[PDB]
Symmetry: C5
Subunit: 269 residues, 5 copies
């Protein structure tokens, strides 16, 4: 809907053109210089803001990359260290796959019930849904699988530890994503910028008309487009787990993770 | 902040009525020098705000680590010692006490009620007697893990896995303390703030020659932009400070407590 | 560089601006420099921040590849220090580590890894690796099998097994990092906004300059265009670090360095 | 603040500009604001990036010192948790850890650590530490020996020995980091460039403003100068973090805090 | 710094602008300040980012070298703490660690490491190291063999071997980090764009300023030129942190410091 404010800006320019006649007869003067000062200041602030928004997006993408890496290596360790424990391989993989989908639902604020039931027995589904953090309970359940292998003497404390480390890595991902989801960049940044950029763009033609006359709408819309484009891009990057164009394709990412883990456990889709 | 905008409107009205006597004295104010001054100030505000934002982000990262480390420690205790519930409860109590005590320390509020709610009075007295109560809580959590080791319930290896988590917490405590004693700039920030203020108040006098009656509208818009950006950096620089929003810190301490009670079967109701 | 075309086009736009400046008043068009200074400075600021992001992405790609060389060197060092007599195991693992590098290279370039793999590995494993949808990952799994067997045979203890397992983790992070950089680009809306904005700005500029500069319009306009276009195109080249373009990573040379290193450390 | 001298000098330059503005035309000399806006903006940008480097360096220094407290707190926690009955060992190790902090402070301040060391350690150990060309590093060695003896006596296993040795490693990173910051400044050519341009800019400024401002020249010229100088001086204050001045790190108080923490945790 | 030539050259361009400003109309040349303010500000922004990127490479390079000192100190400390009586092993390992630093320096400076190697190690080892296409890597391998042999002889357990092995890994990361900075420069089109652009801008500048500044043209033009040229050449110097220029790393002094540390008092420890 950025196109709406561009069209609206064209209308404000036309108002600026038709009312420029009555400018002197009202006592209003508007030069370009003060608006260059204001405009450059806003651009500087948009530049820094946009940079921060991009960094949050990059970090979110990084965290999701770590899910894939840590889950691959955990399965790799299980196969290298306990090549014959295939039942354990399957149970742990189902938890690792459930973890990814559940993380996705947590970040999207959606119901993980259907995905959980496709992957896990109903008793486990109930236990997981009852927790205030189902992704955390899933890590705990995956941990019990490894813990029981340890108690049975199949894993030593050392080899248990190598795998426990991967669960710590997933916990770090969970916390990182939760931090990015609960933290926006402070609201007062968009509040300043969104209101400020819009007000600036609509007032601009009134300041340009004295110099540009009929050429006001073209130059005004070009300037507005530049500022609005840069501003709206930051808003989209600030919410990496959202549904908007340039947000993370979390569903495709979860599919990739699941396909990887079924590839390493001899299963076919 | 709304007050200085009103003050800026007041300065504009003064600028408008007094612009008359300007020539008969020889005083001039053009836009170009204030354009120079304004852009330089905007540049400095950008860099300043960048540093402030960096401090805000680190504060959230440190707090994110409390939640991560405490979750995994409790996970390890269940996976490695599933039957040691007395130990689970005592350790959970210390970890929860650690979070609340850390919050109170950074906010300079009294941690007594949270401590008495969570721990036996003997320990509360010991903790309150220390000049570093949050560190003492980590020490007490360490004793719990250490006792399990002497009892032969943890090996040196599995002890080590849990000890690492207490280390993550010590790093959080030190990092927050460093962030609290901060700021880095030696209150040269006060200068920078005043500079923005003087600029906003002198501005209508520099614009009035060009803008005339339209001066207060344009002058207040520009002031609003600079003052807002300045106050945002001020808020970001002091994430644990005197005039800060307590909702996330409170939400985090509540979140970790709810998680750990969930992980130890203390929730739901039987 | 096809920038020379857009500069020549800019020279043409300037001459048009010069000859048509006559009809400016008779059309009602006024163009001053001040609004374009505002727009130009805004574009420069956004280009600066964008170029910064492109550079960092290029730098990360570079770092990831540096890690391949480091991790593979130390894994081989550990094998020699810990199991100096196990040369059969050395040779097998080295072939897997070298194959990992080439396979990663081919994957990022979207080229066929077959000859490099057949040169390094027996055909039996090659078919197995190529049968997977994630061949580079399958190679790490196979390298892991070698180390796991040394452990089961009692040649490695759990501790020394762990020391080497850590290096395989370091390689897994590299694989994930590179894949992330390959699938996730700097968002395409950075390019669209900036390319449209920079090009339109450069072509409209002489029409705004002509009133002040007159005949001097094309020289000053092309200089400004060149400055913006050069900086913009630099970001384009940095944004695709795994590509074939001259200012891209010398991945072929890097893989050769890695292979020469690992055969140097094994008397090969 | 000796910034006031440069402001007073700036007031004088403004007065000269006002009274000498008459002979401006009779010489053919003009100074407009526009070129000084360009120059001023460029200088502001470079001052920004520079202060950014000065700031990061000061922050790192504070970070390094923060780590001393964390690592020493945890080492003592480990000693209590793992060896609750070994109080003699607790005291000896604590005295080395406290000595390490004071010795680091003296090294960075280039002061004599002898009195602090004698307060903490037996004279034999003091002699041994001071005989070294790197006394703070030698203190880490001695702390490692205490831990090493516990390992040899069987009170620490290799695992628990390793847990504590890791903390000595963190301290080694602090020592090297501080030494690196002490010898490596923000490069001097940044300060030299900036110092030369900022001073010249502020003194030339009133001559460039007088044509526009007339009688208001000293007030606006001083405002602008104060703004650049305040920002420039901020770097000056951040650049010497290990010094004694009021805006430098309170290393003495920091060392006292470290010592009080460690004696709180050992019942002293 | 060859900036002094281009500054003097810029003064000449100003005098040309002053003497030819009358003839501007008779040639059809008009040049205002506004377009050059736009162009100059864009260049300053780009120079700012470029210099920031150059400084970061410098900082990383200094950090990698700091790690050599740290990792080598702790490796020697560990050897003294864990195997206090193995002085023959201490000496051999220290000589490899010292050779590693000097060999790294020569590799980055593209100089011959032969003399330094012969000074520190027996000739048999020198030939083995010189025979490798990567001598610094071969030195780490030899330092690793020493540790590996202590392990095989039962003097180190797998655990204590691992503690020392970690430090050799830390050194491998330094070697790789330095090679990455050395084999890859910032892209060569950074140097090309900016140098041509800054120079062309500075020489064209007086022709645009003279209409405003008249006789003051050479002074203001050279001032602006000095600011842009200095910032540009400093960035060029920092991008090559292993080079010989004055703002580059004192690698020789750093290697001497490392050598003096590890050989502090005839290698004698308590
Ligand atoms: Zn990992
Ligand atoms: Zn299986
Ligand atoms: Zn952790
Ligand atoms: Zn329990
Ligand atoms: Zn609950
Ligand atoms: Zn490594
Ligand atoms: Zn071999
Ligand atoms: Zn064989
Ligand atoms: Zn093929
Ligand atoms: Zn630590
Ligand atoms: Zn004690
Ligand atoms: Zn000082
Ligand atoms: Zn280290
Ligand atoms: Zn010795
Ligand atoms: Zn003249």
């Amino acid at each position: 809907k950025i196109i709406f404010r561009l069209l609206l800006n064209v209308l404000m320019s036309i108002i600026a053109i038709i009312s420029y006649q009555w400018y002197e007869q009202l006592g209003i003067h508007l030069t370009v210089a003060p608006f260059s000062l204001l405009g450059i200041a806003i651009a500087i602030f948009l530049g820094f803001r946009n940079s921060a928004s991009y960094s949050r997006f990059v970090e979110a993408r990084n965290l999701w990359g770590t899910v894939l890496i840590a889950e691959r290596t955990l399965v790799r360790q299980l196969r290298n260290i306990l090549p014959a424990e295939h039942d354990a391989h399957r149970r742990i993989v189902s938890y690792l796959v459930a973890f990814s989908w559940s993380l996705k639902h947590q970040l999207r604020k959606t119901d993980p019930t259907a995905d959980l039931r496709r992957l896990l027995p109903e008793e486990r589904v109930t236990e997981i849904l009852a927790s205030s953090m189902p992704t955390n309970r899933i890590l705990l359940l995956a941990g019990n699988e490894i813990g029981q292998l340890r108690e049975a003497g199949k894993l030593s404390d050392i080899t248990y530890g190598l795998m426990d480390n991967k669960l710590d890595e997933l916990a770090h991902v969970l916390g990182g994503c939760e931090r990015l989801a609960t933290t926006p960049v402070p609201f007062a940044y968009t509040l300043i910028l969104q209101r400020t950029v819009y007000l600036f763009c609509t007032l601009l033609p009134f300041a340009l008309v004295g110099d540009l006359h009929y050429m006001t709408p073209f130059v005004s819309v070009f300037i507005s487009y530049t500022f609005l484009s840069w501003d709206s891009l930051a808003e989209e990057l600030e919410d990496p787990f959202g549904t908007a164009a340039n947000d993370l394709p979390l569903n495709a990412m979860c599919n990739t993770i699941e396909r990887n883990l079924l590839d390493m456990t001899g299963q076919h889709p």
